[PDB]
């Protein structure tokens, strides 16, 4: 990596002295040393890069977003200096975009990545990075065009294949996504050994009836992406008791279960009132989990946050549930009514995290036709009775009754999570 232009070669002794302070962990002295070099040599690209790297390390030491914001600006200043070597220009702007994403400045990172691609039009890795920038902001349409451009010049780029396959799957192009996800994973290219691609390749195969799906789940488990073949969540705390079905006593949330079962009719009645008089509060399931049928959910809490307008629609239920912070404070779960109508098949799927357990309270259960499988075990609901399962295990639902089926879904923190963990885990 050639990082020194002609001028920087003449001051290499001063640059090496400053960088040695950084390598020895004397970040404050290194910051000041590079600051002096920037003052004395304001056009040195290596002095400016050294200043940004020191600010970067200082932000890590101090855990400071603001210090990192200063480094992000200094990385940009490197790019505007005269005679900047190409390797240094790429390194500086790449780190700038990386740190912008870390801070959540997704629009800023996208502008930096666009600049990089314009400066280095033949660097396909930079285009791949640009596609990731679009994916992080939710712009799957532009991400898809980026990876199409990469695959047109390098058809066997494994990184581009898995991301193109990921986008196809997210768009419900199930059959189309399989060879991209499969060949991309099989390429072994850097960035393809990722649980997200194992997850969706196996799921795409399950949807088309490809029995090879569980061979890929087993491989993802062997490579450390899944806790097991059945439990395939990707946002996990390791060591939590892993079990498809739970009894109330096993969870320890027996007071919550008793309150739900004793008061189930008021929960039902408010749910039916919303069905009859405010049915627009039930929103269709929107995560492509249905093969067919009608399935809607009316959410009272999400990410540990109460929906005030939703609780105006079920005020007694929200008043009841507020007494239980083990569910209202579950920032990795929800509290929601779930209605499902005959002719519905929910694809086998898993939730995103092993940090929650999922309770189902039966409210209106037809006498026949409704059942739920979790792992290798299938059960049914009962009106006024709670079922508890770990939805980080693969689960699947059928509704073949002759009338609607209404349940109440209550997520709780996994009981083995300490209060310190329940407070620090990012919301999902």
């Amino acid at each position: 990596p050639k990082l020194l232009n002609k001028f920087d070669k003449t001051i290499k002794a001063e640059l090496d002295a400053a960088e040695k302070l950084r390598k020895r962990g004397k970040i404050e002295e290194a910051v000041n040393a590079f600051k002096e070099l920037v003052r004395k040599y304001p056009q040195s690209p290596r002095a400016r890069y050294g200043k940004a790297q020191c600010e970067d390390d200082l932000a890590e030491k101090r855990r400071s977003n603001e210090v990192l914001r200063g480094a992000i600006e200094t990385y940009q200043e490197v790019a505007s200096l005269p005679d900047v070597p190409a390797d240094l220009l790429k390194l500086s702007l790449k780190r700038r975009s990386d740190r912008q994403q870390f801070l959540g400045h997704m629009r800023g990172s996208l502008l930096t990545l666009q600049r990089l691609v314009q400066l280095f039009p033949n660097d396909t890795s930079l285009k791949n990075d640009l596609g990731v920038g679009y994916l992080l902001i939710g712009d799957n349409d532009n991400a898809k065009k980026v990876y199409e451009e990469v695959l047109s010049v390098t058809p066997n780029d494994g990184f581009a294949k898995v991301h193109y396959g990921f986008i196809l799957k997210a768009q419900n192009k199930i059959a189309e996504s399989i060879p991209y996800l499969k060949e991309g994973i099989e390429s072994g290219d850097p960035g393809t050994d990722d649980g997200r691609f194992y997850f969706h390749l196996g799921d795409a195969m399950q949807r088309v009836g490809n029995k090879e799906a569980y061979k890929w789940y087993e491989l993802g488990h062997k490579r450390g992406h899944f806790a097991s073949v059945w439990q395939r969540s990707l946002y996990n705390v390791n060591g939590l008791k892993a079990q498809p079905w739970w009894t109330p006593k096993e969870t320890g949330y027996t007071e919550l279960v008793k309150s739900l079962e004793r008061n189930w009719k008021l929960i039902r009645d408010e749910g039916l009132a919303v069905m009859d008089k405010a049915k627009g509060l039930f929103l269709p399931e929107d995560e492509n989990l249905r093969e067919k049928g009608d399935w809607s959910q009316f959410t009272l809490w999400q990410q540990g946050r109460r929906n005030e307008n939703a609780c105006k629609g079920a005020p007694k239920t929200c008043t009841l549930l507020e007494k239980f912070p083990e569910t209202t404070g579950c920032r990795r779960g929800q509290i929601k009514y779930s209605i499902m109508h005959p002719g519905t098949h929910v694809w086998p799927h898993t939730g995103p995290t092993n940090c929650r357990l999922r309770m189902h309270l039966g409210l209106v259960i037809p006498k026949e036709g409704c059942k739920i499988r979790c792992a290798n075990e299938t059960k049914t609901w009962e009106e006024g009775k709670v079922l508890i399962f770990d939805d980080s295990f693969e689960h699947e639902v059928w509704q073949d009754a002759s009338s609607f089926r209404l349940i109440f879904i209550v997520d709780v923190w996994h009981p083995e999570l300490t209060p310190q963990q329940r407070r620090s885990l990012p919301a999902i």
Binding site: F166, Y235, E287, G351
Partner: peptide, 18 residues
């Protein structure tokens, strides 16, 4: 988009620095 019931988003958590 949020990962409420599934794992369909590219990332399910938000990025907010340290």
């Amino acid at each position: 988009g949020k990962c409420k019931d599934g794992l369909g988003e590219y990332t399910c958590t938000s990025l907010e620095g340290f």
